[PDB]
Amino acid sequence: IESGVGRLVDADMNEESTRLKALQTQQQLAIQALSIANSDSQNVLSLFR
Amino acid sequence: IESGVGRLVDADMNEESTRLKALQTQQQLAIQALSIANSDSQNVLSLFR
Amino acid sequence: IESGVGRLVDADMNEESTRLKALQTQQQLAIQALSIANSDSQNVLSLFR
Amino acid sequence: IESGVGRLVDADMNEESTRLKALQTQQQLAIQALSIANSDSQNVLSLFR
Amino acid sequence: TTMRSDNQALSAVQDALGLGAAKVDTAYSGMESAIEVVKEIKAKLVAAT
Amino acid sequence: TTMRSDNQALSAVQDALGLGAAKVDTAYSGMESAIEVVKEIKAKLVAATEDGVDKAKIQEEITQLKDQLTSIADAASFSGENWLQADLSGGAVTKSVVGSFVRDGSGSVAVKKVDYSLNANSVLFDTVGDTGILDKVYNVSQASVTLTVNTNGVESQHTVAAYSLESLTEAGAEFQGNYALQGGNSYVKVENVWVRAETAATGATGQEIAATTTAAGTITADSWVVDVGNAPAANVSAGQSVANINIVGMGAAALDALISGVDAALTDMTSAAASLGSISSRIDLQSEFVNKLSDS
Amino acid sequence: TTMRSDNQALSAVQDALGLGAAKVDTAYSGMESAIEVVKEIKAKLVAATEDGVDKAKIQEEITQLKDQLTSIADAASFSGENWLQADLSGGAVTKSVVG
Amino acid sequence: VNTNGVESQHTVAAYSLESLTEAGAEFQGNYALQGGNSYVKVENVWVRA
Amino acid sequence: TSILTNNSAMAALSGVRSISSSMEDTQSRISSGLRVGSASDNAAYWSIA
Amino acid sequence: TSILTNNSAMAALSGVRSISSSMEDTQSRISSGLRVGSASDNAAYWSIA
Amino acid sequence: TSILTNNSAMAALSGVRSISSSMEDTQSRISSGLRVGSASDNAAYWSIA
């Protein structure tokens, strides 16, 4: 019964580690892109000066 | 017969390790070179102040 | 044979790095000189006004 | 005869280890100095800007 | 201009030197293998006397 | 403008090639699973050769393995084009992958495709005809070859005896092209093995012409056809197919025939797996070349 | 005026030179691909020269590689003038690039 | 092949059996009579006789 | 400088893709042995194995 | 390079799963002996035993 | 420093292969006696034995 519970409940932690690394990289990319999107709106100031 | 299969199929690990290190270094150099190539483009802005 | 191919084909990357830096500096100088040469032609406007 | 061959041919590995460490340090110094010599040529850009 | 032409000639000589060094290395490896085989032959024959 | 259109077409071809590579990978994984299951079945059958070992337990073992093979065959699909379990009613089903976009020199445009055949050795449980690589009987004889010949426009597989070239050249035979004449008997080289042939107009079924001859001194000028008959010296066939294995009291000879048939099926399936791997490699090379061409 | 006309002609020659350079680059890339494939074919065949290796697998690999060669030869076309898979019935065809 | 009582080494071109049998060659034991030329089998390859 | 295309960038991308494919192959090799891949390597030897 | 998928990681995961299954089987084998330890092994030999 | 070839690595690999072969041979020697191998050593003495 304990073996069955473990099989039904436990997680093969290797792919969770892979997902953790992948999500860290994805978050880094998202932060960089979000910063670029924040910065790109300042270009309009050149015309009016 | 099993020894024959091993001779026909197995790979020496040391040579693969050397290849892995070489390819990691080559990837690092290629990424650095690509970054330099990307940074090359925006130098033209100095002509247009 | 592989060693011979390497010595005949491979490049000692140190001098390529030196050339890369030298060409970056030369390009920066060339862009600056080109900007100066483009700008200097506007001096004639003083006479006619 | 084998002892004589060993005496004439073998190497006292301790000084080879010392040389290996010394050459590693010398290579590190050489790489650092080469990087400095590559970088120092960019100082001229200040005058023209 | 003459010195630059000489420098190009020395670069070609360097390439030829690398090719010749590869050839000499291959020939020396073959010679070492032949010497080992002939030593084995001599040992076998002096055993067979 | 024309080059931009061609570049867009090349991008579409690259996407199609990626899809085809995914399909090939799925099919090849299914093929590897089938290889493993068939090897296990062959090992179980070899262990079953012992008379003292009960055959019933091995019987449900092979039943479970056959159900596993069926599950492998039907489950291994990507987008409905599973490249397996094809319908062999026509016997010439062909599937293709978009390979490259080619513009001809004379102002023409066309799309090239890479073909893969599922005729009789890479089908994996033909749905209707039940004549696939599995679920079919394999002839087991020492000195015969299974050759496919089309009669009246429909192909069929016939088992005929095969003769070695060394015996033919030792007996004092006169050869011409792919035709031979040892004496009162004639042979044609339809494949790598030589087979006795009938002169002409014997079958009267419009069979494919094996070879044509000329005078050549003492050779009759006729259009020769491979002999559909000429059964081997010992015509033995597998008792049951791979999908219908039942070893309850078969006997020694039936067990040997079944083992030989299983081995032949395994060899054909391994050849199919090698072909699939070659197709995957060709797809990878084509994708890399298309990328280079688009960059250029 | 004559020198201006010559300058315009030289600009046209420059455009033609760029077009020819693109054509030659495409042909050379295809040529390298064909060379690599043929090298692979030769390696496979010299591996297969052994009698202990079943030759059907090598034959199918060579068939696949030949199909790859055909596809590379017929696909390496820039603007119709592909410099490959020409018509040799006449005996010799010469392609020219405006220099 | 020994021309006389003493043995010797000789080099002779080899002809594939398929090439002979394609051109309508009569055979008897280890003999081939494709045309005017006559070929025989020495160990495994057909050579001109 | 052409602002819409960077041929050096395409060359760097091609190099990166080649290195990435070779690296994936060598990671498979180092992680599961098998000098001869599943079937994507030389098929004849795999079939023999 | 895609940060959403990792084919090399997936192949490594499958390899790790195979090694884990084989190691668990061998661990049971070494713990309890019984090369035919259960009906999951060769059923005929288990029944005979 | 050539990034695509490492001659020292090839020399180390050759040394490792030689040491591994010698170690396997001496392991057979130390595990089953037999100064003269099965038949891969000097054939004449093995035949006499």
Author numbering:
A (entry chain a), B (entry chain I), C (entry chain Y), D (entry chain b): 347 to 395
E (entry chain D): 51 to 99
F (entry chain P): 51 to 346
G (entry chain A): 51 to 149
H (entry chain A): 199 to 247
I (entry chain I), J (entry chain d), K (entry chain L): 2 to 50
The authors write:
Here, we show the atomic cryo-electron microscopy structures for flagellar filaments from enterohemorrhagic Escherichia coli O157:H7, enteropathogenic E. coli O127:H6, Achromobacter, and Sinorhizobium meliloti, where the outer domains dimerize or tetramerize to form either a sheath or a screw-like surface. These symmetrical dimers are the result of outer domains being able to adopt either an “up” or “down” conformation.
The D2 domains in the S. meliloti filament form dimers between an arbitrary “up” conformation subunit (Sn) and two “down” conformation subunits (Sn + 5) and (Sn + 11) as depicted in Fig. 2b. For the S. meliloti flagellar filament, a prominent 3-start helix is created by the outer domains surrounding the flagellar core, which gives the S. meliloti filament surface the appearance of a 3-start screw. The S. meliloti filament possesses a single outer domain, D2, while the ODS filaments have three outer domains, D2, D3 and D4. In positions with residue variations between FlaA and FlaB, there is support for FlaA at position 205 and FlaB at position 16 in both flagellins of the ASU.
